[PDB]
A paper describes a structure:
We have investigated the effects of two mutations identified from HCM patients, A119T and G111V, on the secondary and tertiary structure of a purified actin binding domain (ABD) of [name] by circular dichroism and X-ray crystallography, and show small but distinct changes for both mutations.
G111V was only reported for a 31 year old male, with no family history of HCM. For the G111V mutant, the mutant residue Val111 now occupies this same hydrophobic region and thus reorients Val112 and the subsequent residues away from the molecule resulting in a more flexible conformer for this loop region. This larger alteration to the structure for G111V may help to explain the decreased thermal stability for this mutation observed by circular dichroism. The G111V mutation had the greatest effect on stability with its melting temperature (Tm=56.8°C) being 5.5°C lower than that for WT (62.3°C). G111V is just outside of one of these regions, and although this mutation appears to introduce some instability into the subsequent loop containing this binding region, it may not have a large effect on actin binding affinity. After photoactivation of a small region of mEos2-tagged ACTN, we found that the rate of fluorescence decay from the central region of the ‘photoswitched’ area was reduced for both G111V and A119T mutants compared with WT [name], and this change was significant for G111V.
Numbering used by the authors: 35 to 257
Amino acid sequence: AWEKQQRKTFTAWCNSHLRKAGTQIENIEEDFRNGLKLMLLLEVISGERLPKPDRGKMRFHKIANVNKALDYIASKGVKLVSIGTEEIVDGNVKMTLGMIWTIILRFAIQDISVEETSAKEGLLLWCQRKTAPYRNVNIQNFHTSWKDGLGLCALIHRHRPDLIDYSKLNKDDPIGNINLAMEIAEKHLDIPKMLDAEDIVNTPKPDERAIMTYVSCFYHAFA
């Protein structure tokens, strides 16, 4: 169930940046094979210029573009262990997801710094701080603590109490709470809906990379 969740969230996330450059992806397992939109994604999120892309359709042109992407990422202190150009070009689902996770981590999460605490840990602390007043919320992690929708509704309410009546909410309708939160964030905070509520609720432990990805948008939307 983790691939399904990551596929939705990572794609939605990539799309939240690609739109700023006039394009989208649809199918993440194929839409980065040629390197073109992968390079473009890196430009948008970094604000840096990558080398000019190769629009040739053969494998060798794709390898060149993907290497422009991966070399750039490695220039930003990202150690690529088992992510390989050939398999991105050829189309490996797992590795594509992992590569996009690595970019999300580096560019959406790594630089989050809260009370001398950075990255995942720093994002976690910010969440805990913003949700401390909410007795029906207990953020310990980026999976089970977000399952019931209240964490997300609390982050919204904390910054924008005008968008949500939090006191009406409870644990009884986790699918509704998540959708509510995603609807408000989409409509008012310019954060596309990146989670499938159904997947999140119906799994003992939802995917933490996906959850982190989405929660990082709230962090950036508010700061």
